[PDB]
């Protein structure tokens, strides 16, 4: 079925409880793996690319029409 969603939630939660600001880089890219974003990014080893992808996606997603 599809609360692979409920999986990604708990995993993302567990990742979050273990990270502080010093782990920004690592936190982005393993969130990027949890959300299956990491494969759609050209530069999978830059953290800013991964986050740039999620941001633009979310910007589109909130567009009217």
């Amino acid at each position: 079925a599809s609360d692979e969603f409920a999986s990604e939630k708990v995993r993302l939660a567990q990742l979050t409880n273990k990270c502080n600001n010093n782990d920004l880089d690592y936190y982005i890219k393993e969130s990027g793996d949890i959300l299956g974003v990491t494969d759609k990014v050209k530069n999978k080893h830059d953290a800013k690319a991964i986050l740039r992808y999620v941001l633009e996606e979310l910007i589109n997603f909130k567009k009217l029409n």
Binding site: L12, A13, T16, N17, L24, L51, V54, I59, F61
Partner: protein
Amino acid sequence: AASPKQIQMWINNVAEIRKTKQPHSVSYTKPMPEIDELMQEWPQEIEEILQHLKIPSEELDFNLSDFCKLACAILDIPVHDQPNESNVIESLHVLFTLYSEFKSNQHF
């Protein structure tokens, strides 16, 4: 009052109980906006400003942390003062949640 050293210390001690207790769950140090409110469409003025904001992933010290705070600012996700050393991580979590439940709906 007390040092922000002492303050973070206090927060870590409280978090240490709650986090390790339920590892499947995140509890924000300060309140964060409801996810479904963050899912509202752009008000048209903002949408129109955004057509022209080009993503400056490359800005020489738009370092990772600066970039993160811009992205949150764009999405109305607050970055709180506390915890002084894990606030960006809490904000990013809200961002990734938002992303997650969008992808969820898109997949019908």
